[PDB]
Design an enzyme around this catalytic site. Structure first.
Site, PDB file in Angstrom:
ATOM      1  N   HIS A 175     -33.090 -15.605  14.784  1.00 20.37           N
ATOM      2  CA  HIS A 175     -34.429 -15.893  14.509  1.00 20.37           C
ATOM      3  C   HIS A 175     -34.924 -15.708  16.042  1.00 20.37           C
ATOM      4  O   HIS A 175     -34.042 -15.616  17.093  1.00 20.37           O
ATOM      5  CB  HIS A 175     -34.680 -17.335  14.342  1.00 20.37           C
ATOM      6  CG  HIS A 175     -33.966 -18.389  15.222  1.00 20.37           C
ATOM      7  ND1 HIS A 175     -34.190 -18.580  16.365  1.00 20.37           N
ATOM      8  CD2 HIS A 175     -32.441 -18.730  15.116  1.00 20.37           C
ATOM      9  CE1 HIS A 175     -33.052 -19.404  16.933  1.00 20.37           C
ATOM     10  NE2 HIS A 175     -32.308 -19.297  16.402  1.00 20.37           N
ATOM     11  N   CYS A 205      -9.148   8.652 -10.442  1.00 22.05           N
ATOM     12  CA  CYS A 205     -10.326   9.392 -10.445  1.00 22.05           C
ATOM     13  C   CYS A 205      -9.748  10.686 -10.337  1.00 22.05           C
ATOM     14  O   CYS A 205      -9.063  11.300  -9.832  1.00 22.05           O
ATOM     15  CB  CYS A 205     -11.127   9.110  -8.984  1.00 22.05           C
ATOM     16  SG  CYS A 205     -12.554  10.051  -9.003  1.00 22.05           S
ATOM     17  N   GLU A 213     -28.227 -23.045  10.128  1.00 21.05           N
ATOM     18  CA  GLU A 213     -27.560 -23.168  10.923  1.00 21.05           C
ATOM     19  C   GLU A 213     -26.346 -24.255  10.688  1.00 21.05           C
ATOM     20  O   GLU A 213     -26.748 -25.120  10.045  1.00 21.05           O
ATOM     21  CB  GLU A 213     -27.961 -23.468  12.176  1.00 21.05           C
ATOM     22  CG  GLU A 213     -27.232 -23.274  13.497  1.00 21.05           C
ATOM     23  CD  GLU A 213     -26.294 -22.357  13.757  1.00 21.05           C
ATOM     24  OE1 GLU A 213     -25.616 -21.858  12.902  1.00 21.05           O
ATOM     25  OE2 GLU A 213     -26.186 -21.941  15.149  1.00 21.05           O
ATOM     26  N   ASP A 240       0.757  -1.368  -0.013  1.00 18.66           N
ATOM     27  CA  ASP A 240       0.004   0.055  -0.189  1.00 18.66           C
ATOM     28  C   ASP A 240       0.786   1.383  -0.088  1.00 18.66           C
ATOM     29  O   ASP A 240       1.063   1.831   0.998  1.00 18.66           O
ATOM     30  CB  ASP A 240      -1.173   0.022   1.181  1.00 18.66           C
ATOM     31  CG  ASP A 240      -1.867   1.010   1.151  1.00 18.66           C
ATOM     32  OD1 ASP A 240      -2.293   1.994   0.168  1.00 18.66           O
ATOM     33  OD2 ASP A 240      -2.459   1.260   2.265  1.00 18.66           O
TER      34      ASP A 240
HETATM   35  N1  LIG Z   1     -10.788   7.526  -6.341  1.00 20.63           N
HETATM   36  C1  LIG Z   1     -11.174   7.016  -5.310  1.00 20.63           C
HETATM   37  C2  LIG Z   1     -11.821   6.690  -4.145  1.00 20.63           C
HETATM   38  C3  LIG Z   1     -11.969   7.462  -2.958  1.00 20.63           C
HETATM   39  N2  LIG Z   1     -12.553   6.647  -1.920  1.00 20.63           N
HETATM   40  C4  LIG Z   1     -12.829   5.185  -2.587  1.00 20.63           C
HETATM   41  C5  LIG Z   1     -13.219   4.174  -1.810  1.00 20.63           C
HETATM   42  C6  LIG Z   1     -13.126   2.993  -2.746  1.00 20.63           C
HETATM   43  C7  LIG Z   1     -12.421   3.101  -4.014  1.00 20.63           C
HETATM   44  O1  LIG Z   1     -12.528   1.716  -4.661  1.00 20.63           O
HETATM   45  C8  LIG Z   1     -13.478   1.168  -5.090  1.00 20.63           C
HETATM   46  C9  LIG Z   1     -14.624   1.826  -5.300  1.00 20.63           C
HETATM   47  C10 LIG Z   1     -15.932   0.946  -5.930  1.00 20.63           C
HETATM   48  C11 LIG Z   1     -15.465  -0.302  -6.228  1.00 20.63           C
HETATM   49  N3  LIG Z   1     -16.491  -1.059  -6.917  1.00 20.63           N
HETATM   50  C12 LIG Z   1     -17.778  -0.594  -7.510  1.00 20.63           C
HETATM   51  O2  LIG Z   1     -18.411   0.364  -7.034  1.00 20.63           O
HETATM   52  C13 LIG Z   1     -18.562  -1.376  -8.236  1.00 20.63           C
HETATM   53  N4  LIG Z   1     -19.907  -1.488  -7.941  1.00 20.63           N
HETATM   54  C14 LIG Z   1     -14.170  -1.056  -5.952  1.00 20.63           C
HETATM   55  C15 LIG Z   1     -13.187  -0.007  -5.575  1.00 20.63           C
HETATM   56  C16 LIG Z   1     -12.254   4.150  -4.499  1.00 20.63           C
HETATM   57  C17 LIG Z   1     -12.119   5.361  -3.849  1.00 20.63           C
HETATM   58  O1  LIG Z   2     -21.020 -23.416  18.018  1.00 24.04           O
HETATM   59  P1  LIG Z   2     -21.799 -23.284  18.934  1.00 24.04           P
HETATM   60  O2  LIG Z   2     -21.215 -22.377  20.240  1.00 24.04           O
HETATM   61  O3  LIG Z   2     -22.266 -24.512  19.596  1.00 24.04           O
HETATM   62  O4  LIG Z   2     -23.039 -22.501  18.665  1.00 24.04           O
HETATM   63  C1  LIG Z   2     -23.893 -23.175  17.238  1.00 24.04           C
HETATM   64  C2  LIG Z   2     -25.218 -23.658  17.947  1.00 24.04           C
HETATM   65  O5  LIG Z   2     -25.997 -22.593  18.381  1.00 24.04           O
HETATM   66  C3  LIG Z   2     -27.246 -22.831  17.948  1.00 24.04           C
HETATM   67  O6  LIG Z   2     -27.688 -22.210  16.828  1.00 24.04           O
HETATM   68  C4  LIG Z   2     -28.379 -22.481  19.204  1.00 24.04           C
HETATM   69  O7  LIG Z   2     -27.875 -23.345  20.433  1.00 24.04           O
HETATM   70  C5  LIG Z   2     -27.321 -24.558  17.279  1.00 24.04           C
HETATM   71  O8  LIG Z   2     -28.498 -24.725  16.806  1.00 24.04           O
HETATM   72  C6  LIG Z   2     -26.078 -24.571  17.031  1.00 24.04           C
HETATM   73  O9  LIG Z   2     -25.564 -25.895  17.069  1.00 24.04           O
END
Ligand SMILES: N#Cc1c[nH]c2ccc(Oc3ccc(NC(=O)CN)cc3)cc12
Ligand SMILES: O=P(O)(O)OC[C@H]1O[C@](O)(CO)[C@@H](O)[C@@H]1O
Ligand SMILES: N#Cc1c[nH]c2ccc(Oc3ccc(NC(=O)CN)cc3)cc12
Ligand SMILES: O=P(O)(O)OC[C@H]1O[C@](O)(CO)[C@@H](O)[C@@H]1O
Lengths: 440, 440
Positions: free
Chosen positions: A248, A149, A317, A119
């Protein structure tokens, strides 16, 4: 053809009858090169892509040259540090980039890292030729991501959102920081050589993100991971939106302390479902997509909203295999070896004829890709599914993921801001049992 | 919040207590516009993309303007029909394009079609403006796919591979047909206006496939389906290769007539595994990727090859839920309602706590995407998984898919040629039981 099933992951492996003296043997990593002028979202892309790659199981790390600079040069004074005529700072900046590349080599060749996101501006062909030399000599692949841009509104917005709040501008007010940053961008404009896939950069593997993802130039995608990155960049957007995640309403199995199954909402679960409808209504969202699993309890919860909803089998799940519909006490008594194995390795542990949290990630990846494409979304799901999705949005590791707190009758409101998600918790004031179990 | 589980698909739906007089209520379709000079692989793209979209469950149809022309004008004589100064044929060609668009409207608005691939040159802005007018007036989305290539080797290869064998060149020899086709291409070159996403086509949703997929220009991808198409086009290739598909060698459950489970190879299954190694060796493939499921029987089969292999949980046999490890006789006697429901609707039928062939497709989509990226691949899998993959490669419908013949100890050798796959069957001369069951 003698095989044994590994106790944790349940993988069939050749029976390894190691000889008297057991011997251990002790694809190519990728350097993702960010390219572009400052305030082009390079750090935003770096961080988001790293978050996604790590979550899908590709070890990824960002090497930001500016952080190496903040470490080498204690306090930042002004754009004068970035001047092309600043001989001393130009030497320091080069040293910082080389020190970051040194750490890239160590990460990919010695630490088990698969992807290093470099970066920096990397705006000159000279800098990029040097990064290519570094990649070729170390047998690393190079993939370039350039953000182009010309919109001054986009540039000003980026400076206001994440640049003015940078550690460089701690002692500055918003106006001073914005002015200094504009001058800082200007320091890079003269030497900036955009990627040219037509003539000069024809053989380079690259993506040009043009006008904040409105358009893309994709050149020579070599492999699976580059193809995935390209698809991800094309699905994400920077439009404002909200992600609501909840389980849920309490079900009959929850009351009995039973795992899995396809039980219906308890009386309290039905009360939560009504409370959720009121909550959703109070959010006053122009459009809202509602997603559920194919399990009854999430569908009954969505039914209370009186909104269109879509059922995803991928949101079902975690499958407990032979342990389905059992209580944790019955698991410990019938399958004590299985119970202890899971407690020791909760992420990688696979239930017999069932799943692991690792399997959940693979299943949920299309959910994540669609969540990225969408705007306002409400996901009504299950405890393990919710922990996995939350680990993606909150950048939590595989080790932390099975222990994230996702209580019943509680909405997790996710707002994308800066370089991640702001998380607000909203308990809808309906009692339920607790299904959270801490590590031992 | 009263729900009922649909008997076939096992989907929880609101209990529908229709009133005295039950009332029936009786996203936007897409026109994919192919763009480019002849022999640019437009028909190849059209057919392959349609095959993939139909397999994933998006009803798709190709409307090739040339087929409407072959129907309106009985026999083809020469390139003179394509001359820009041919007033009469130009009127006929326009009528054919309009008749194809009429059928596009009927397909998308009246037949439940979701995607119409308009396969023509559509080389002029005028023709494309007319297609846009047609799309806007019918509330259809328009997505353009342009194939651009200046390589004469690529053009000549396409003419030799699929043009000379066209019904237009039935009475011609290879040299006459090649010469006529080159003249035919030249008729289109003067009026050809490529897509310009920079100025003219800036607001159009498009993909430019440049130099047989070496480079891509992607502009304004609006939705999920366009994003999927773009990802698909970036993963496919036209490099020569072979796909070998087979089941694991006969297992212990096969001998007992039991479904699912994770049983090991029988003595005959181990003999097939050795026979498969010899077969693989005799194919003399420079590189070969070997893929298995996570089930023992496929891993034991791969173990006999002495080649590196990769286990995919997505390749695991269809999950029979409560019917796992049971014989079909035991299914009919314990679950007669379930048995009859499956026999009546084999594709959509979901086993209780299990899967349907429809679920298999969703699970296998990443397998298909990776199969496309790769070259020589051997997939060692299971009966239902194999039928699903084979339905993709052989363009078989959802209705045909659960009944495709995939015998044990038999390799299906797939060679990509023209507009699909050549299929060779290789029985490796090892006896096994038969697991195929025809419809009733
Ligand atoms: N130039 C410039 C930017 C300023 N802030 C940004 C944040 C992300 C950025 O990069 C992306 C933005 C947009 C996408 N894709 C799309 O919008 C496709 N739906 C991928 C990467 C560019 C800029
Ligand atoms: O990975 P853990 O902590 O066992 O949690 C997953 C469990 O939680 C539940 O969604 C609810 O107890 C179960 O259906 C599932 O097995
Ligand atoms: N011009 C031209 C073509 C001649 N035959 C073709 C067959 C397919 C074709 O279109 C594609 C080729 C290649 C790709 N993708 C890739 O090769 C990416 N690996 C996508 C579409 C173009 C031509
Ligand atoms: O869809 P069908 O015809 O029942 O075939 C799928 C079955 O075939 C098998 O692979 C072998 O009998 C089973 O494991 C699986 O249930």
């Amino acid at each position: 053809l003698e095989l044994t099933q590994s106790r944790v992951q349940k993988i069939w492996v050749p029976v390894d009858h190691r000889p008297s003296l057991p011997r251990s043997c002790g694809n190519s990593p990728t350097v993702i090169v960010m390219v572009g002028l400052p305030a082009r979202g390079k750090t935003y892309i770096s961080k988001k892509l790293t978050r996604y790659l790590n979550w899908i199981g590709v070890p990824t790390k960002v090497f930001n040259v500016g952080e190496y600079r903040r470490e080498a040069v204690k306090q930042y004074s002004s754009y004068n540090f970035f001047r092309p005529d600043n001989e001393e700072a130009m030497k320091v900046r080069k040293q910082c980039a080389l020190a970051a590349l040194r750490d890239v080599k160590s990460y990919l060749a010695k630490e088990g890292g698969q992807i290093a996101v470099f970066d920096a501006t990397n705006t000159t062909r000279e800098r990029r030729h040097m990064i290519l030399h570094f990649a070729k000599e170390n047998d690393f692949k190079a993939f370039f991501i350039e953000s182009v841009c010309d919109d001054p509104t986009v540039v000003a917005s980026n400076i206001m959102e994440v640049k003015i709040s940078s550690p460089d501008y701690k002692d500055c007010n918003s106006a001073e920081a914005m002015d200094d940053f504009m001058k800082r961008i200007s320091c890079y404009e003269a030497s900036y050589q955009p990627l040219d896939p037509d003539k000069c950069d024809r053989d380079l593997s690259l993506i040009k993100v043009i006008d904040v993802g409105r358009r893309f130039l994709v050149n020579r995608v070599q492999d699976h991971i580059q193809s995935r990155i390209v698809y991800y960049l094309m699905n994400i957007h920077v439009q404002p939106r909200t992600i609501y995640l909840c389980r849920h309403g309490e079900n009959e199995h929850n009351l009995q302390g039973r795992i899995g199954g396809d039980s219906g909402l308890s009386s309290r679960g039905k009360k939560f479902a009504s409370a959720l409808s009121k909550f959703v209504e109070e959010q006053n969202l122009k459009d809202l997509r509602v997603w559920t699993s194919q399990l009854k309890s999430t569908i009954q919860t969505a039914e209370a909203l009186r909104l269109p909803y879509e059922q995803w089998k991928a949101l079902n799940e975690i499958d407990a295999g032979v342990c389905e519909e059992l209580t944790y006490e019955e698991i410990r008594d019938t399958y004590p070896e299985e119970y202890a194995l899971r407690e020791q390795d909760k992420y990688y542990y696979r239930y017999p004829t069932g799943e692991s949290y690792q399997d959940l990630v693979q299943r949920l990846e299309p959910v994540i890709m669609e969540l990225e494409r969408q705007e306002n979304v409400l996901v009504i799901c299950h405890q393990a599914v919710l922990r996995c999705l939350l680990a993606y949005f909150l950048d939590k590791s595989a080790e932390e993921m099975p222990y994230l707190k996702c209580p019943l009758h509680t909405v997790l409101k996710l707002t994308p801001v800066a370089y991640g998600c702001r998380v607000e918790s909203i308990y809808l004031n309906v009692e339920s049992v607790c299904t959270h179990r801490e590590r031992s």
